[PDB]
Symmetry: C3
Subunit: 149 residues, 3 copies
């Protein structure tokens, strides 16, 4: 019974208890800090969040952020009725996806050489910075990427 302490300790040195081990699937809590190099050979799974935005004018926008920091933007739909400098007219970018500093992402017009970009800005509005688009709409594709913080 004095020797159980030992047996039981030679068990926590293998799995169970509050000890992280060199094998098994385990869970870990708290602000871990790693000063040296680290490596993952398998899959590392950072948190994901995705958001759909009808930016207005016909401009669809699917944003996909991972670990709150880098978000990839996928341009869809078709824009119409905007001036060279205008702030887009539809749904704003949600708090969770809004940049700290302004970020211009570059889209392209489907089946054309003409191009455009839009500014996501911290407040979450999206100003347009392509040429003045007429009532007759043009399809807008292309992927953007910006650091959230």
């Amino acid at each position: 019974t004095i020797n159980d302490d030992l047996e039981a300790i030679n068990s926590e040195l293998t799995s169970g208890g509050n000890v992280v081990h060199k094998t098994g699937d385990e869970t870990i809590a708290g602000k871990k800090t790693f000063t040296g190099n680290v490596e993952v050979n398998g899959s590392l799974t950072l948190p994901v969040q995705t958001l759909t935005v009808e930016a207005g004018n016909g401009l669809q926008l699917q944003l996909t952020k991972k670990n709150n920091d880098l978000v990839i933007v996928r341009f869809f739909g078709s824009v119409s009725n905007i001036q060279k400098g205008w702030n887009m007219s539809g749904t704003w970018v949600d708090r969770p996806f809004r940049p700290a500093a302004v970020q211009s992402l570059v889209g392209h017009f489907a089946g054309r050489d003409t191009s455009f970009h839009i500014d996501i800005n911290p407040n979450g509005s999206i100003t347009w910075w392509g040429a003045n688009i007429d009532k007759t709409p043009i399809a807008t594709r292309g992927n953007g990427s910006y650091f959230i913080k």
Copy 2:
């Protein structure tokens, strides 16, 4: 000899054994989960895989994916003989690099203002969505980025 258990345990509390320690270089196996914040100050090394594609029409394409999720695309070569809507004619994107949902990446024509984009789609075909290109080829550069899953 009763006290060796102890000595030997006060060793696994330092290194060796199946225990992860606050120092040394160690290896770890199994689906580790980290509920709290984590930090790396050194280098974190996620798995890398790179792929070269002759998309056809003269369009070179070097894809580089890291941790199976985000791949950066580097456009090379020069495209010729394609319509505004056509599916590119050469080697398809391999299974390991194929998106779940379609992704348009935006390239640019070297020494010109004219631009283009192409669609990588889940099956791995690459449809072209720039203007109709004549027999006389044009050089295509620019980097794209898309989430694999």
Copy 3:
């Protein structure tokens, strides 16, 4: 006093000592390797470094790299006085942000359909690959992304 060894060991199996635990905030040193899948539910914080470059001709360039590998480029200012093929005239990209292989990032001209790209190359020079720009300057925005190694 023989039993303190035990008490003291049943403490290092909880926190303190050189042992990583399933709870608390701890620090870790050395080349950790993770063969299995890993997961982070909170925030994972990779090292960050940001750099501002006056590329010359009026082309501003803010580069932001994370974990030394992927850097997002933010184009600013306005370019003027460059030929279709020229190497930009102002401050070069610093060693810490210079790619191994050349990377073209695609910018866009503010309030226009016209587009451009520039080549960051390993030595750190930035060759321009848009159309020949006159003395009258044009504003240049858009975000790029390239793998550093």
